Amino acid sequence: DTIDPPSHAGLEKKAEPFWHDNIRSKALDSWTPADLLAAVELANNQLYITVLRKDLRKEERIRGEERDEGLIKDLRKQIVELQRTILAQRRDLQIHSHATN
Amino acid sequence: DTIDPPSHAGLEKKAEPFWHDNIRSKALDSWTPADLLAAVELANNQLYITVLRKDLRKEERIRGEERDEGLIKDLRKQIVELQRTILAQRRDLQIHSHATN
Amino acid sequence: DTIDPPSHAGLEKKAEPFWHDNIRSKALDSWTPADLLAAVELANNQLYITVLRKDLRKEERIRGEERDEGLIKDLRKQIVELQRTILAQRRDLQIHSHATNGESRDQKKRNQNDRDARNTKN
Amino acid sequence: DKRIRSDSSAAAVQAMKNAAVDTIDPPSHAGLEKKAEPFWHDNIRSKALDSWTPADLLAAVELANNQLYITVLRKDLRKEERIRGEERDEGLIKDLRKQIVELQRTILAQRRDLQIHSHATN
Amino acid sequence: DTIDPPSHAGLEKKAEPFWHDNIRSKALDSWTPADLLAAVELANNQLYITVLRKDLRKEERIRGEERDEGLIKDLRKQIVELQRTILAQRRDLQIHSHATN
Amino acid sequence: VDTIDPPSHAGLEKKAEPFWHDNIRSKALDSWTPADLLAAVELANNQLYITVLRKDLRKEERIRGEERDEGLIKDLRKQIVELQRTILAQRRDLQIHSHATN
Amino acid sequence: DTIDPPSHAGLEKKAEPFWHDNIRSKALDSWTPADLLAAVELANNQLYITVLRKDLRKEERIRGEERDEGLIKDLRKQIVELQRTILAQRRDLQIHSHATN
Amino acid sequence: DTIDPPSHAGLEKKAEPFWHDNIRSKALDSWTPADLLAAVELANNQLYITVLRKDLRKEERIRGEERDEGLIKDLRKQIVELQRTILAQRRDLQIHSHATN
Amino acid sequence: VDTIDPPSHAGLEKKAEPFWHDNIRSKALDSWTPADLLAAVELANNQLYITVLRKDLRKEERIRGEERDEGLIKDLRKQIVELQRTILAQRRDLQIHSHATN
DNA sequence: TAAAACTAAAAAAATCGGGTTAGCGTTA
DNA sequence: TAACGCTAACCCGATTTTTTTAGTTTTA
């Protein structure tokens, strides 16, 4: 009850869980080839947030002179940029809540 | 009564109270798998504001030469950025007041 | 009647007056659990403006070499940013005037009648 | 549910009831500055008294404080513009000029949010 | 016939000509107390443009080493910012052409 | 007669009069309010000022060698675009843009 | 048949070809005096792009130490800014395709 | 079954898989010559994301003094810029989900 | 004759002609005004210029070691996105975007 | 060389044209 | 004590202004 991702698109291995969730959220007939390309980019981004968040939690534990507040500031911003991009991607595929019921 | 969060998404442990509140705000049938991924990001952010606010109140108590006005300025900005992101996330899930009232 | 704020959300103690005012501005049945979380953030910000304004008035009194014009400039900007964020928060909860009274054009007459009353008096 | 027709007798009662109570008093916790009261009274009188919610009144304090604060900054600016020679701080002059425009634009947004802009009142 | 400006608002003396022109541009009954406050800010800005333009013409006459191109650049920008603000203010009072034509 | 005269206090520059006359003729004379006429002075002054800046820019572009100031050239180019975009907004505000006049 | 450009507006001599094209693209009766002023600015800009592009092609030929990558970058940006301004100007005069098709 | 890309447009060789997917997502009669040019730019961008992502994963493996956090920051931003441009391109060709579903 | 010829003064580059012909054919010939043809030259020149910048970029990306200029690489990448976005605006302005033609 | 400050375009908020309720006098 | 004749308040979908934001330039 799913589709398999395009080979050329380059879905990361740990992103598959995310891919399956996105595809199941809209009628299977309604996925075009163009949409499936776009869905790879969405899944990759949803994965990448988990990776950056891990990086950030590490840096926040360090305390004293070693603590890099500049890096902390950057990781915080990169996480918000991804989150907002993901909202745009969802809207583009019409799998945002307004379009689904 | 509620749904359980996706394992791969990475909901932080102290964010569960927030997760439960968000899911209860809209009919259970109307949550898709894509929406549940998005709801993890919302809950994590609602938690993270409480964490930053604690950090800020600490720095504001310090007075004299030790007081870092640059860090105070940054924490204040990061808190507004999160707040505005949360409004966007709510709208995307249709759990903002207009959609529920 | 009112609602009590969520424990986990972390409403600051001196923010309670603000919380009560916001909740009373819309029908109690119409508050969801998601909205109540959002209402804590609104109340905290309405409090925090009063705190920054106090900080600013202090710095503006200082004169001479000690006067920090850079800090004065920053506090002034932070106050406008908060104010604009509060307008967005209000809109999100539908407790801004448009949502609690309707389209602008549908307020025209209501107001006229009041202006009229106010003359008959004088 | 629907609001009373502005035709109704009922409507004309509320209007007369309204103008008897001339104004509302500002929330204590909000922190209206003392010299801002004149501005507060003008804003409240510009729309029907029944139509002010508790949420709106909090927001109206922020509007009044800003309308006052413009007069304060403008005084500061006129002082600096008189100074000439080496003492003249063109950097501060530039900043005061910008802060005044930012406030002005914020005030327009605040008015619209409370529905006391001309479109809603005329 | 006209209205008199609020005392506390602080209409500058040389701004009165501008004040009178703005008030005459819409029916006298239709000015509320809130509008009159707002109209002071409009009149002060229409005055202030004339003041800055005088300052600019002075600096543009100076030539050689004394010429301050940085100040010239700033005065030019300040004049455009005022002009754009005045268009917003006009719209807010409904004395822009669309509302009066 | 054909036109209106500009408000004295507004400060229409002398060489801007040709522009003023063109703008006023572009909409019915009865339809000009006192508020509009103030706004129309700012429009005319800006339409003049573009011609002045353009002259300044063409001078600097002729200079070549070490004397050539590329920083000033860059600034004059930007100032001219900002004015042009402001003029579009001003026209819209007076309803003398093409959409309103057919 | 065409109209002749206003003298005071300052249409550049080599811009006339552009002027003629723009005027012919909409009914002659429908040009007001205000529009003709605006049309001069459009024609001057359409000319000036050709001039900057020539400047850019010169700089791109130079190679070695003499090559100014900073100027190349600036000329590239100035050309895009003009192009986008021209789109706005066209729309304002209602000689864009939507209005004429 | 498909169309062949314009020679002058310059579709990169490894982009062909992407090209085929995009063309198949809309009725063949409905592709104009202008659209086909635009579709080359879309395909090239969908390819180029895979290339940048590879570059980024390399830099993220390096640790110690050699690690360039500045380059890591830049690659992360360039990937989001491409992704947002791709959404605009899709909308322009009407092969986004709203137009096809 | 199923196309139009470009205005001489507009300055269509020689290698841009293939692009010009494709754009003109994408909309009914009667519907091209003289103003549109000027605008269409700018569109064609930009569609060409992307191919030129992309070639420049691929050269710089091959260089590795100390010679590699990451600053130039960053700039070329940005210039390519700016052009792309401008082209979308130009298409819409001429009504040869898919919505108008489908 | 990073931090502050500008600036288009997209996402959002307000407005608007035209239709439908439904209250409420007022005429009988 | 009704029935009828208006209007005000609300509603749906379209379009117009405005804010927010992603992204660039500037300045110390």
**Residue G99 — φ and ψ, nearest 5°?**
-80, -20
CA distance B14 to B16: 6
Helix (H, G, I), strand (E, B) or coil at I95: coil
Helix residue ranges, H only, chain I: 17-24, 34-62, 70-94, 98-101
Query: Would you call B17 and C8 a contact, using CB atoms and an 8 Å cutoff?
Result: yes
Structure tokens at B78: 């990061």
Residue G80: in which H helix or E strand, if any?
A: helix G69-93
Instruction: Give the contacts of D75 (CB within 8 A, at least 6 positions apart).
Output: none
Closest residue in I to H28 (Cα) is: I102
Going from N- to C-terminal start, the domains of chain E cover 13-100
Vertex D81 angle, CA D80 and D84, to 5°: 90
Ramachandran region of residue G96, left (φ > 0), alpha (ψ -120 to 50) or beta?
Answer: beta
- Report chain K positions within 7 A of protein CB atoms: 7-10, 17-28
CA distance A51 to A39: 19
Q: Between helices C16-23 and C33-61, what is the axis angle to 10°? A: 130
Cβ of D105 near strand J (under 7 Å)? The reply is no
By CA distance, what is F55's nearest residue in G? G10
Kindly report the CA angle at F38 between F33 and F40, in degrees rounded to 5? 90
- The separation between the first and the last C-alpha atoms of chain A, rounded to the nearest angstrom, is 20
Distance I64 CA to J7 C1' (A): 36
Determination approach: cryo-EM
Helix, strand or coil for residue C111? Answer: helix
Neighbours of B96 (CB within 10 A): 23
Distance CA I86, CA A99 (A): 30
* Positions in chain J where some atom is under 7 Å from a protein CB: 2-16, 22-25
Beta carbons within 10 angstroms of residue H56's beta carbon: 16
Helix (H) or strand (E) holding A43: helix A33-61
CB distance B40 to B3 below 8 Å: no
Residue nearest to nucleotide K6 (CA to C1'): D7
CA angle F5, F7, F12 (to 5 degrees): 90
Please state the φ and ψ torsions of residue D47, each to the nearest 5 degrees.
Answer: -165, 155
Subunits touching H (CB < 8 Å, at least 3 pairs)? A, I
Q: What is the DSSP letter of B101?
A: -
C-beta of residue C117 within 8 angstroms of C-beta of residue D16: yes
Q: Cα–Cα distances in Å, from H63 out to C83, E78, H59?
A: 44, 49, 9
Q: Give the angle F90-F95-F100 at the CA atoms, nearest 5°.
A: 130
Q: How far apart are CA B61 and CA D38, in angstroms?
A: 36
Please state the length of chain I.
Answer: 102
Q: Distance between alpha carbon I85 and the CA centroid of its chain, in Å?
A: 11
Q: Which residue has the tokens 């569609």?
A: I47
Cβ proximity of F87 and F47 under 8 Å: yes
Residues 6+ apart with CB under 8 A from G70: none
- Three-state DSSP at A27 gives coil
CA neighbor of I33 nearest in space, from I67, I62, I13, I4: I4
Instruction: Please state, in angstroms and as integers, the Cα–Cα distance from residue I13 to each residue in G72, I10, I31, I46, following that order.
Output: 19, 9, 24, 10
Residue G82 near residue G47, CB atoms below 8 Å = no
H92: exposed, middle or buried (C-beta count within 10 Å: 0-12, 13-18, 19+)?
buried
Spell out the alpha helix ranges (H) of chain C.
Answer: 16-23, 33-61, 69-93, 97-101, 108-121
Alpha carbon distances (Å) from C111 to C95, C104, C118, D121, G8: 20, 11, 11, 6, 50
- I28: buried, middle or exposed (CB in 10 Å: 19+, 13-18, 0-12)? exposed
Among chain I residues 82-101, those with CB within 7 Å of any atom of strand J:
85, 89
CA C73 to chain CA centroid, Å, is 23
| Residues of H whose CB is below 8 A from I22 | 6, 33-34, 36-37
CB–CB of B32 and A80 under 8 A? no
Q: CB-based contacts of F18: which residues, under 8 Å, 6+ apart?
A: G6, G8
- Residue H21: which of A33, A71, A92 has the nearest Cβ? A33
- Which residues of C sit within 8 Å Cβ distance of D? 14, 17-18, 21-22, 24-26, 46, 49-50, 53, 69, 73, 76-77, 80, 83-84, 86-87, 90-91, 95-98, 100-102, 104-105, 107-114, 116-118, 120-121
Q: Name the token pair of B26.
A: 């809209």
Rg, C-alpha atoms of chain B: 17
Q: Which of B49, A65, G36 is nearest to F21 (CA)?
A: G36
Tell me how far CA of residue A27 lies from CA of A94, A95, G7, in angstroms: 11, 10, 65
3-state class percentages of chain B: helix first, strand second, coil last, to nearest 5 = 70, 0, 30
- Burial (CB count within 10 angstroms: exposed 0-12, middle 13-18, buried 19+), residue C111: buried
All residues of chain C having their beta carbon less than 8 Å from the beta carbon of residue B100 are: 32, 34-35
- Asked if residue D4 keeps its beta carbon closer than 7 A to nucleic acid strand J, the reply is yes
Q: Report DSSP letters for D59-109, one per residue.
A: HHHHHHHHHHHHHHHHHHHHHHHH--SSS--HHHHHHHHHHHHHHHHHHHH
Contacts 24+ apart (CB under 8 A), E69-75: E69/F72, E69/F75, E71/D90, E73/F75, E73/F79, E74/D90, E74/D94
CA torsion sign for E26, E28, E30, E33 is: positive
Q: Which tokens sit at I65?
A: 């070691």
The answer to whether the beta carbons of residues H82 and H48 sit under 8 Å apart is yes
Instruction: Tell me whether residues H30 and I102 touch, CB distance under 8 A.
Output: yes
- Helix or strand or coil: residue C24? coil
**Radius of gyration from C-alpha coordinates of chain E:** 17
| Cβ neighbourhood burial of B57 (10 Å; 0-12, 13-18, 19+) | exposed
CA distance I37 to I44: 11
Q: Which residues of D64-84 are buried (b: 16+ CB within 10 A; e: fewer)?
A: bbbbbbbeebbeebeebeeee
H-type alpha helices, F4-102: 17-24, 34-62, 70-94, 98-101
The answer to whether A38 and H90 have CB atoms below 8 angstroms apart is yes
User: Which of F75, F83, F93 is the closest to E97 by Cβ?
Assistant: F93
Contact D25, D50 (CB under 8 A): no
Find, among F51, F69, F52, the residue nearest to F60 by Cα: F69
- Burial classification of residue E64, based on how many CB atoms lie within 10 Å of its CB (0-12 exposed, 13-18 middle, 19 or more buried): exposed
What's the CA–C1' distance between D8 and J25, in Å?
9
Residue B79 has a CB neighbour count (10 Å cut-off) of 21
Minimal Cβ distance to C83: which of D29, D62, D121: D62
SS3 G71: helix
The angle, 0 to 180 degrees and rounded to 10, between the axes of the packed helices A33-61 and H69-93 is 150
Q: Is F30 exposed, middle or buried (0-12, 13-18, 19+ CB in 10 A)?
A: exposed
Residue tagged 């809540």 (tokens)? A97
CA distance A71 to I57: 30
Residue I33 CB neighbours (<10 A): 19
Residues of G in contact with I4 (CB under 8 A): none
Q: Residue A59 — φ and ψ, nearest 5°?
A: -65, -30
Report the C-alpha gap between A5 and A37 in whole angstroms.
Answer: 8
